[PDB]
Design a protein around this ligand. Structure first.
Ligand SMILES: O=C(O)CCC(=O)C(=O)O
Ligand SMILES: O=C(O)CCC(=O)C(=O)O
Ligand SMILES: [Fe+2]
Ligand SMILES: [Fe+2]
Lengths: 332, 22, 332, 22
């Protein structure tokens, strides 16, 4: 049930702003950072929404005007699509799958250019969609530098230390239009996902749902993304998608969602909710040290087999046929 | 075999390096 | 067409002594050891029957009486079965497949005991079958030692040298009853198979027929053997067995068949042909050093993946399910 | 990955060792 905004400002959102899917879900717990149960969840690599970390407190005032005015003149990656779906793809892997045609295109532009583009679409009633996704770096301006330094490093550094994580590799700034969707995928880093402006519905699946989510081949550009079109699921190709069960929540300004490494996540900016802003915090996982093996360890194993085969056969397109030859009439 | 890389939906100063420089 | 025995002693065998199978075959070339084409075949790891190596010339006089009298008092492995099929199995792998029930049993006995056993079966018209398969070692007697030293080491040592092979690991003595069959399998060593007494029909398949022959899982006791029952092929489980094509020949006293490493072979002692005697020569293959990869190199790869998975998962029975999880809806 | 062992339808003096001793 949608939370009530302080000062009797009404429900933050309603059901009609959520897209409709074929699978059930249960809620991700929303807890205080001081609550021992929250610590227990993170320790165990289970998702939790923390409501009071103040992780990005200084960024809560961010909006397009403030950012355009202060974020500097560095380049920003902006994806353009004609669909609500922004399927991530790795450009370096495109040569090995000549037949892959991306539904979204990347363009590098200045921030003010991104804003202007957003403005032209609105005014002309265009259907085009943009999604800015850019790692925060040294070209940001002084005020942004001041804001960034004001993030709650004390709290997050302790988390990093307590969990034995590796280094912070980056902070991705995400600015999306209402209705934008990042289709289901998993990342190989730990993530504290800090919501800043607007609302995002986040649907997560544990690593043990690998069999229901059908990730692309490792060498395909959409490595780590699910092949299933959540809007039109092909049960003939992906029969176990009928058994998938998610954990969901809607995060708003001030909320931080722990997205544990290897956990699948599908993220959508609420329909008619305006633009969204998020900053994530990606950390390398702890080192690999006991049976039974965890789901995520089996995932790691499968990825490695795929990678080794690709290298040994000298052509990633030969991976499938060898794998098939290995199992038919033998293990299946 | 159980070892893992660090790939995410983003290309490879930033992160820890950005913070310290600042 | 069956060869004619010298001195007008008639055909060495006839068609009716061969079992009937579902697949076609072509003949393996029979050539002189001095013929350059023979050398070309061996060099290329293709089978050839050599008719005049004199490799085991001194063993041509061997028969049960001579061997009982001279082969010493060491132990001999003798397999007993109630079927003509002597499917090889690795006893060390039996613990991991508790449900595997061998159709043949191994018994260690003295040579004279093997002979006596053969005698009792004949006299009592029993249906039991025996197959002696024993590595030649230090307990053999002086006359056998004299015979063994009289093998054509000059010729075979040159082969070993020319092909870059590793060491001779052993010589297996095989003494079988008429009608005995060693079901299709491949070995990971190079083999010169030297026929001594009686006739054996040998059906070989190249390594690129892996997909048609369905070897057991690597951790199963029947690793390297085909799961297909050549006498009653299950096309539902093994559909590509319908595409198998063999190379065949019948070897007799004096013949040597080069069975190249990784080549499948099915070997049968002719029906109503009396006992057979063979001595093989197993050599480790050359060292692994270029694309495209050979069929046998892909086989090596598949074996290694199976082995690594077994070790990493800590339980070989988990190999199949992981492999299936890897490919369904992803590579198949 | 392309490396191979030396297994055959037989368990592991003999071979080269037998010959030289003799
Ligand atoms: O917010 C989004 O659209 C995607 C973010 C994401 O996938 C991540 O932070 O790992
Ligand atoms: O002669 C036989 O029955 C089997 C021999 C065999 O498989 C081999 O020498 O590799
Ligand atoms: Fe992600
Ligand atoms: Fe063999």
């Amino acid at each position: 049930e949608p939370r009530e905004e302080a000062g009797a400002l009404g429900p933050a959102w309603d059901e009609s702003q959520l897209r409709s899917y074929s699978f059930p879900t249960r809620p991700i717990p929303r807890l205080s950072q001081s609550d021992p149960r929250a610590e227990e969840l993170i320790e165990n690599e289970e998702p939790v929404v923390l409501t009071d970390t103040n992780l990005v407190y200084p960024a809560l005032k961010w909006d397009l005007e403030y950012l355009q005015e202060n974020i500097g003149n560095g380049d920003f990656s902006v994806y353009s699509a004609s669909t609500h779906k922004f399927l991530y793809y790795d450009e370096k892997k495109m040569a090995n799958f000549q037949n892959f045609k991306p539904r979204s295109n990347r363009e590098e532009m200045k921030f003010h250019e991104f804003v202007e583009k957003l403005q032209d679409i609105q005014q002309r009633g265009g259907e085009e969609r943009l999604y800015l996704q850019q790692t925060l770096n040294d070209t940001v301006g002084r005020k942004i530098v001041m804001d960034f330094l004001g993030f709650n490093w004390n709290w997050i550094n302790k988390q990093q230390g307590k969990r034995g994580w590796g280094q912070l590799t980056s902070n991705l700034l995400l600015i999306g239009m209402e209705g934008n969707v990042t289709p289901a995928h998993y990342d190989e880093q730990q993530n504290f996902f800090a919501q800043i402006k607007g609302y995002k519905r986040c649907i997560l699946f544990p690593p043990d749902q690998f069999e229901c989510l059908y990730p692309y081949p490792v060498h395909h550009p959409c490595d780590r993304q699910s092949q299933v079109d959540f809007d039109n699921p092909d049960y003939e190709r992906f029969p176990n998608f009928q058994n998938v069960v998610g954990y969901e929540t809607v995060v708003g300004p001030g909320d931080v969602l722990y997205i544990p490494m290897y956990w699948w996540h599908h993220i959508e900016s609420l329909l008619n909710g305006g633009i969204t802003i998020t900053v994530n915090f990606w950390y390398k996982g702890a080192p690999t040290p006991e049976y039974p093996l965890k789901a995520h360890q089996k995932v790691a194993i499968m990825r490695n087999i795929e990678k080794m085969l690709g290298e040994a056969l000298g052509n990633p397109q030969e991976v499938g046929p060898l794998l098939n030859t290995m199992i038919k009439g033998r293990y299946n | 075999l159980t070892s893992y890389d660090c790939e995410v939906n983003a290309p490879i100063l930033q992160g820890e390096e950005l913070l310290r420089a600042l």
